[PDB]
Structure formats: structure tokens, C-alpha cells
Amino acid sequence: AGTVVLDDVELREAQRDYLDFLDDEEDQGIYQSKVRELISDNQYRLIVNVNDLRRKNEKRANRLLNNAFEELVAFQRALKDFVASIDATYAKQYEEFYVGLEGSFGSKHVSPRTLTSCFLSCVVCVEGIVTKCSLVRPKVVRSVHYCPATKKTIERRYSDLTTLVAFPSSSVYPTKDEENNPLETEYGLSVYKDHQTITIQEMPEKAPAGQLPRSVDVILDDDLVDKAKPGDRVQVVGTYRCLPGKKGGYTSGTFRTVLIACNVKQM
């Protein structure tokens, strides 16, 4: 697709606002030492207090709580910019960095029983116990192939959940050359990331007496794979989104709602 965007006032202004938020030169901020600690520890994500952001810039906090995905993208872009600024060498290792959230969310502090469609597409906080966990599985991101017949190597890029909706043109594994010469997959050069799924239930101590419990399903990405175990009391902060069903003609009109974690805390 050759379509590109030239100007966008909102996105550029939000990126500038986050750039000013994470400067910490004329202020008593600490995020600079946090970034230096991340570089020292080879980790690739940051946790930022929501109350701190609201104190410094209330409008940005309101927009981020009300709208998650675009603001999170702007955060990640700003992190990439400042990591490049402080030490451009370290930013080469990882594609993109991530943002965690922390602080008192207030009204959005929501129990698994009180999660509703009113909080869709926003960042929510939930307290619960872990009941089901699944095995860690790798997922392909970048694929590399070699052709012994013509001595040529090719690479294909994959982006499935990066974009909201995917199409059959993507997510196709190449196996043959343009002249039907067989290709040999080379697993060393490819790129994979880990994936896990967990389930969280409202704690029996908090649930009303005599009533059945209610649960939420969470997806854990590459960094947060081993941070949870069954039978554990945790607090999860993350986005609440709908799940796109696969292609079909007739739809009943009922989506599946899945919480995508950004921060997992052992209370």
C-alpha cells in the first residue's frame, strides 16, 4: 500500500506533549535514571505513574484513559526517540519499546464483576485470582528463506495484531520460488516472540455470598510470559478490547471481549 499521511495535528501534538513529559531537565523528575536503569538491565519497557501524568498534564491523562491505542502508540514512539537520544546504540537491539501504567485510576478501578461495555477501548485496572494458565508458545514475526537452486535468500515481515484487522493477503508462509524452485526455511535467522494466555477470577472473599463467580481472559505477550501462575492473587492493568471473529457471511452480532495486559502486579 502506497498510501501515506503528511500531517496530523493531534498525533504530532500528543507526541510533543510526551516529549516534554519525559524530559526531566528543569524538573525533579526521575525518568532519566529509570531509562538509564533499563539500559543497564537490558529490559525494554517503562512504568509511568498515571497520577504523575495527571498532575503534570491533566488533558493528556484524560485522553489516555478515555482513548488507549493511539496514545499508547505515541508513548512508544516517544520512548524510542528518547532511547535513541540518550544512547542510540542500545535502541538498535529492539524494534519498539513498551509502556506500563501505575497509580490510582479512581473510577476505572473495576472488579471482574463490574467490567462492562462502557469501559471498552479504555485502560482498566482489575484485581483477581488466577485459575487457568497455558503453555508458552512461540509466534513468528519475521521469516527468512533460502533457495539452493538460485543461491538467493529472502525475508518476509508479519504484522497481525499490530493492525486492527488482517486480510488473507498477509499471514501467508512462502514455500516456492518465482520459478517453482523449492525454498528451505532457515529457523536461525527468523524472529519469534513468546505468547501465553491466562484466566482471572474475582476473589471469593470479595464476591457476594452465595453467587457464582465471574472471570476475564488475559493475553500475555513476550515480556510478561512467566509473571503469573495459577492460584495467585494479582492486579492487572491493561486495555479492554473486542476480538475480531474470522471471516463469514452471517454474524449473530456478539463479539468476544478480551483484556490485553500491559502491567501485571503481585499485590
Added chain:
Amino acid sequence: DEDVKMITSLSKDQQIGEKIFASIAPSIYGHEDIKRGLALALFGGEPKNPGGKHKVRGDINVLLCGDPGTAKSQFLKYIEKVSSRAIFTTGQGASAVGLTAYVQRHPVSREWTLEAGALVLADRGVCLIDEFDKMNDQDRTSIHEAMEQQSISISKAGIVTSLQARCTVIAAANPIGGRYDPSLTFSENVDLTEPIISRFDILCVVRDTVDPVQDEMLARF
């Protein structure tokens, strides 16, 4: 319309009470006292509750204790036949109607149902229990709760309810040793406990004793 007039005319008769007493259980010989008691049990009384503080029931419970062969079950069968709303159950096991409420998928209709016990189903009716001693712990607990509080509480499968159990209880039983002992009290002769016995207004004892004339008449019938 004319039936009401006939009822009033029968009431005008001075010996209607004895007629009603003798009208119960045509097929059972003897036990006139039991029939007289069952008359009051069927007709019943009147509940009284000054304000919402002091509830007093009007249902007259009946307990029968008898040696084998005295035809205790025939009385319950007759009462079920006569009563407009009467439920029958047995404590031995495999009863068609249970004595405890539970939530289950019905085997036939394949639907998720709340099946209340026989006590709940007999609202303003009669509940009959056969083999009263053979009941297990759960049945005894449910009967005690329904007789003393006149309500049944359910907490199962996310369902919390209280249901009304305004019913009259009639029960039959056998002594501990298989034969009644005149030298021991009623409580010592029966497997039941004193709190359960205290609930019943009328207790009847049917003791088998060899009377040649009575045996001859019973055999003739």
C-alpha cells in the same frame, strides 16, 4: 348452588359430627379413635398472628406408631385419595418424590429445574411420610426445619431462596424392637428424638394383642 343448601341441611342435623367421624376409612376395621383424630387433622384449625410478631399455626400434625400388620399405610393411602392436595413419600428410599429441594437437569425434559421437596409442594395441603424411622440425616433435618419454622431455606448452585411450607404432617412408624413395650415411655420405644415428637399434636399407639373375637372379625373382613 343446591350443594350449599344440602351442606347447610346436613349441618342442621344434630349428629353430623359422628357421621363425619364414621365416614373416614370405610375399608379399615376398628381404630375409631384414630379416625376421630384424623377428622380434626383434615378439617384443621385457624392460624393466628397478632401483628407480625407471634405466629401460631393451625395445622394439627398426626403421628402413628404401630406393630407390624396394623395397617398404618392404608390410612395414609385413604387420606391421599380424599385430600384435594396431598403428597405421599417414603423414607426408606427410591421415592417418586424426594424430601429435599435440589437443582438439577431433569432426565426427561432435559431442562435446568429447581425441584422443591414434598414439603414445599404441599402448600395448604397434607404431606404423608411412610417409614418415618428409616429416614437419613438430611430428611430429618429438613423435616425439623419445616415443622418448627414452617419454611424451607435453599442455598445451592448460586440460588438462595426461602419457600413457604404451610402443610400438615401425618407420619407412620414402627417401634425399635419390632414390638411395643408397655413398660417404657413412647420416646424410649421409638427411634425418633424428643424434639421431633414434641411437634406432633396427636400421637397414636397401635399395639397388637390377641383378642379372639377381634381377630375373628378382622379375619372375616
